[model samples]
Target chain A: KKYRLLFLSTPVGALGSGIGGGVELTLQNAAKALMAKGHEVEIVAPEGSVTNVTKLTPIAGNSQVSAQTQVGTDMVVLPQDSVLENMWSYAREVQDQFDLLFNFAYDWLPLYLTPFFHRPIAHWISMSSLSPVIDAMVSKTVKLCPQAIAVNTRACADTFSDGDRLMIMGKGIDVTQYNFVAKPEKPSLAWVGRISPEKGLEDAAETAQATGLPLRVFGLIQDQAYWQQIQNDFPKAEIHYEGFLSTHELQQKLGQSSALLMTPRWIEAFGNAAIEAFACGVPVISYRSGGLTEIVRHGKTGFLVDMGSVAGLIEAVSKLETIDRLACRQQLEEEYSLEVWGDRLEKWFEQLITSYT
Target chain B: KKYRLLFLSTPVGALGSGIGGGVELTLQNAAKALMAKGHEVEIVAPEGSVTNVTKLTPIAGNSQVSAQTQVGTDMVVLPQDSVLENMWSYAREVQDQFDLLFNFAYDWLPLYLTPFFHRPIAHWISMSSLSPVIDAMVSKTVKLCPQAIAVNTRACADTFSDGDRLMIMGKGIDVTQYNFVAKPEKPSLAWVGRISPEKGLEDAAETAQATGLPLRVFGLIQDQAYWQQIQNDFPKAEIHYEGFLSTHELQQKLGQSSALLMTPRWIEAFGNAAIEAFACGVPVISYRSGGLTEIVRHGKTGFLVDMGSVAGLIEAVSKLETIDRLACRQQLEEEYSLEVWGDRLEKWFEQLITSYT
Candidate 1:
């Protein structure tokens, strides 16, 4: 049955703002896929948030501080006029008009507000447990309806107790958007993600230095200190800071690279950059950490090294030619395609409503 | 209809902690009155929370800071393991078993979480707007069902825009618990409530200093510095800090006083102490501010003086003997009695469900 859905966006930043990271791309892809499947979808996001979707309800308020910036189980501050609160307030106001609400906010308020809504809320948890408080809320919310919880990968879901039971809805990307290249003219490397410490940008730089492959870094310099530390550590590593780019701009740069490196210290939830590389026929050389382990095909599509292993990354770099570029793109179509992702989401949402009844 | 109702208490403190101030007495009185009408009632409160209600579900975690302690539109800090979170979690868990939920929390979480419950929530707002954020939430919540919102007095309700439409369910007291005294052997003065700056203990002390009547202060010394200032200012005033007392113990001490002083520096929401004094045949001399205006029947049950007018308080104190002590007790039985309060609650709750459907 066709359903009307309300999606609450991350409070950390507006939709088009790169500040939201991969979640912005995920929302765009998800909303398009759902609309394609004949589902009516409306989104509520922070003011100035822009999406190409049919209905974009921009809730005006102060943006919440990103959860990534928080340390340990630190206290959460909800400002007087918080966008998270405003988005949820709007959701609560129009709850009766929708069948299901997909909460994209990885914050505490949305999870805490799950049971207060008239309709069942399907929580699309963007990351693994950042704090025990978050884990506890998720655990508590899951008990209300286990089918209502969906995460990106089994690797990300496994971080919490009994979390593996959560629906693993891998991400999706439009294959047509990326013009795949069989081979690269320049035998160089590429790295994508925020220039944060947990993203292990220094590791990618070290690999590029050791291999003597010019590493082109793409993404926001979220932590200037981390980028400066990389600069200080590997001065002679022919590195190019390409800055953050749009989807088309990113794929153009990514398609020119021999391979993309995924080096993350923290549990990376659904490597959006890896799939973006895959779509452009660029093989991924990733650390076997978090969701990257599932995304990388270990010599088939790309290579998966031991986490924090720069030597293994260098070894993987040598064998990048053995992996077929066509197959790298093939893996994305077969597993992380919009049709596959949409089907999973639709079935899960249907089950949630069935169980709710 | 005999309904199974769940009451969520204030997260600021436990039920019997007295840290909740008048709300603690309000909950007990409300629960008992509902139980008397044969409605099955259960309460969820902070850890160490105690009540004479049938089921006291004590939720364990850090208690919330009282709203009274906060200044203008301050940011709310919700700790990892909060009692407010735990209490609401419990309410959401067992909501299917109940027909309606009564929320006594003056904080934002409960008000924000109102729409999520399958069962309708009747918000018993205990105070005036402390912050714009709270007022906004209340205004937003009222649109769901205007009848679901209940406040102590018209004065408290009038504090918000279009708030006068909210149910004016006045507070109740167990009159039989208080032994009415026709005449006191040693006449003086009594003042009750938390010894905070807003409660205006210094004004009562000044009234005593001006009249030479020994002022007996009964209630929690919430702010030591404020009480210190009162003592420092009125050293010649026969002021006695009698400490916080139990209901029966309070009335015993209050019964000996010819007049009870209601000197609040802020808007006093439904003067519990005024009614408690009235129950003991003691006339009240209150300032014309907030709920005190409605509780005190000027020149009859007690006198309503101009706010901050110590001269008006002294003049009213002189005419306290002219006020019939029997009529003061008679008003409690007629208006703020258990039966009267319960009937209003029962009707409001029924109307809430009717509108909810």
Candidate 2:
């Protein structure tokens, strides 16, 4: 059945801002795939949201603070003129025109207002459970409608006590933008994520200094102090800061690197950077933590190390040549392609719509 | 029809703590009245809740911050172990036992969760519009279910653009406990409310100093710094802190006064203190602001002064002789009595339940 789906975008930042991390790219890929399947898709996002989707509604309001910057004790705080409120308000107002609404923001207001709308809201939660309030709301929602939830990965879903019950709709990416690179001109390492403490950028820099491999860091400098401190702590490390780039620009930079090093200090919902690197045929060397443990195929596509072990990452860097670059691209195409993800989401949402009271 | 009703008490503090001001007394009276009318009643409140109702279920959790202490820009904040969340969770679990739920907390979560429940929930909001997020939620709720909202006064409702459209369920008091006093041992005055900046306790102190009337202040010292500042500012005023007293003790002190002084800097919703004073046959002299303007009938039951006009409060004290104590008690009986309020609520809720989808 051709479904009319309304996508409520992230409230943290505009679509190409990089402030919302990988969810921005995920939204675009999901929307495009849905449209490709002949579904009528429209998006309502913060103003200045640049998208290829023809039916886009730009909602203007103050953006919500990034969830990565928030702590567990922090309550769900919204600005007086909140984009989160405005986007959900728009959804509630024009909900009758669509058969289902897909919420992409990892916000409390959207999840909290799920039952209020006449149409059912399927939440594509971007991150793991960070706040108690969100966890409580999600638990309450799952009880009210068990089929309304679809997550990025099983590891991401397992963060909540009720996580095991959710549908694991693994993520996907557009492979056309990324070409396979079997060999690189310069044998260097790469790290991609928001330049924050939780991402463990310092660990990657230390490993780069230890191995004498020129490390390239890419992503939004979310915390200025943390970025400054990283440079100060590893002054001897041969590092280059490649400011946030477009998908085409990022993939080119990523393809040149022999491997992508992920040193996350927290539970990553699903590593979008890992999948993006795989699309570029680059091996992944990551700390055995969070969703990266599930994504990185040790000895095949990349290597997995002890969490926070600089020596382990340094040891893994030596075996970059052992990983087959084509297998990296093959892993991404078989499991995490756009078509595969779109089909999973379509079937999950169809079941929810059918059972909706 | 006989119905089983659940009452969700204020989240700011335990009942009888006086941190919630007059809403504490209002809850007791309303619950008692409903039970008398042959409707089965039960209450869920914070730990240490002292109530006359036999079906009291006290839940242990951290209390929410007082609304009077909050500013306009503040978001809906809750503690990690929120009493508000616990109370609502209990209500949702046992909703099938009750025909309807009466929410007395002037909070966002209760109003936000109204649509999530199976049975209908009627919110008897205690205060006027203070936060934009709350105002937006209330406006959204009114559209979803117009008959679900009931406020204390038109003034309280008018704070929202959709206020006048709400059901005005005027408050009630137990007059049997408060015997009308025609004369007293001392010709003093009374001031009752939380010792907070929004209550304008300094203005009342200045008025008492100007008129040479000994003012007996009652209620919780919610803000210690504000209380210290008021004492420091008006050191010469004959003011006595009577501490938070029971309704029996409060009426004794209130009935001995010639008039009750109200000097709220913000919107005074319902003026629970004004009606309580009238029950003791004490005329009220209030600032012509918020719901007090509608409650205190100027030149009949009490004198209305311009908002923040301490001089106007002093002038009205001299004309206290003009107000008939019997007329004040008669006004209390004719309009704001427990039986009258119970009937209004019963009819209002009956209509909502009958028309509820």
Candidate 3:
């Protein structure tokens, strides 16, 4: 049965740090996938959240919840009339418009207040289970509503123990836009994603210098302090701060570079940029962490180096020539395709509704 | 104008244990106080909440937030359809009935959502700033709705460094229920409050043993494990667990006890039992902590012994006779009586509404 779906995006930062980030990509891909499966969907996100995915509903409120809250405890600083609450408030005001609510926001309020509304909520926990509050709430939620929670990787599952058999649905992306470049330029690198501390931009900057590759950085500069620290710390490193670029521009940069560098300090739910790089026929050299742990093949797809290992990443730079860019592009269709993800998401939502009933 | 008021109670445990506890007493007293001044008050609390001051609008949803969450970093665990959210949801549903909203719960949702609602909600924060999330939310809240945030003591404010400017309205009680007792039997001791670990109830139980004074305990058995642990530890003490008693029934027992003991490990918003004990002509012997810092007189109403000093409490027990029983009752009337508190509350609410207008 076709169901009306409402997707709630992150309320803290913009859809993509003022540019469309991983959350934006996830919403776009998920909505299109769900729509392809004959489901009517709409996205409700914070004001200024301009997502090109689906029919966007911009509800005016405060900025989105922060991901830099590295404290294991939940840092709930949602202002009065917060966009997260306001967007959800509007959703509830017209809740009957949708048959199902899929929450993509890795927020406490949406997860915590799920039972109050009449329509069932399918929590697509898009980020790593970072906060104790989220772990506890998700634990209790899945216990009563077993099929309600889904995560991207087992690494994310390790953070929250109380998932009533969580759905381990790895991500899928549209691989068509990413052109297969058999031979990328040998002397440069590309880094895309939010410039936040946990993403480990400092280590990536050092890697670029050690490998003698000038890094072309694209995506939102979420933390100005952290970003400034990188430039100040590595004065000689050739790091270009290309403002939040579109997917076409991001993939263009990805296709031209020898490899995409990802040095995340914390567990990411699933690195969308890592896969996006793969789709662009660019090898991904990331720390063996989080979703990257599951996706990156040590020698084949990309190098899974020891965390923050300047030597490890520098070593991968020399080996990038041996890795076939064709395998990287083929990997997207074989593993990270949207059809696989759409099938998984549709089934997860269906089961969630049945369990909720 | 006789404004209709709605008081939202805590959503953790029952009115006392897994139910409500001290907040219930404060709400009951405040409702009685507000009602006496010709303001109509209604309490909307979690389903199991039972209050003597007003009829409860018990919400059917699950109790949302947890109070005894021991995460050192304070993981914000909010459950689905949390009673706190449900209570507020109901308040919003019937908000037209009340001219003003009085929030007694110390959860994050209400404090953070203060600026969103159309009606003015006066927050009577009932706890020491225990969570960083709460401290952050309240700090921002006071800036917008300056008079909306009120607490009991500086100790409660100390949790939030920005609380120097907060309104310290304190707390009060219905003196008519508690009659002063003079010339009572001198050898025994008295203790009240939830028999939980944070309550430092074991210390109270041990004091009865060390001092060789038969101890009479009152109030709810909040933590069975802790209560059982205390009972197991202090097997030799003539410690009596006079099951949870009503206020009227309590003073009858309290009026006859020698002196009241308040030894809480956690800083309290305001020690209700301290003032309640004083109203019954029982002098309070408490640690120099939190609101107790302001409430207990070192030599007048009762003794403010150095915290956790068994010897200090033992030292104070000997000099109990010096503290006149009449002064204890008089202190409540002059400093914390509802009649006096009523005048302060009315003016505070008057200014709050005036400021918002």
Best candidate, TM-score: 2
- Angstrom error of the Cα, residue A137, model 1: value is 2.2
| lDDT tens digits, residue span B1-357, model 3 | 577888888777566442466777777788888888998888887766666666677887666444545423333444544577668768767876777789987776787556546677898887777766677678877887887888888788776768986888878898888988896765688888767667777777778888888888886775778777777898999888898887888888888877998897877668888888889889999998788978888889889888788888888888888999889898898888888887788888877766676
Find the candidate with the highest DockQ and give its number.
1
Mind giving the per-residue lDDT tens digits that candidate 1 earns over A261-280? Answer: 99988888779999989999
Report clash pairs, candidate 1: A115-B116, A116-B115, A116-B116, A116-B117, A117-B116
Instruction: Give one clash count per candidate, in the order shown.
Output: 5, 0, 16
Error at B297, model 2, angstroms: 4.8
- Stronger candidate by TM-score (1 vs 3): 1
Q: Output the better candidate (1/2) by TM-score.
A: 2
- Structural similarity to truth (TM-score) of each candidate: 0.85, 0.86, 0.60
* Local accuracy of candidate 1 as per-residue lDDT tens digits, B188-224: 9999888888787778888898888999999888778
Q: Pick the candidate with the highest lDDT.
A: 1
Candidate 3 chain B least-lDDT 10 residues: B66-75
Say what the interface RMSD of candidate 1 is. 2.1
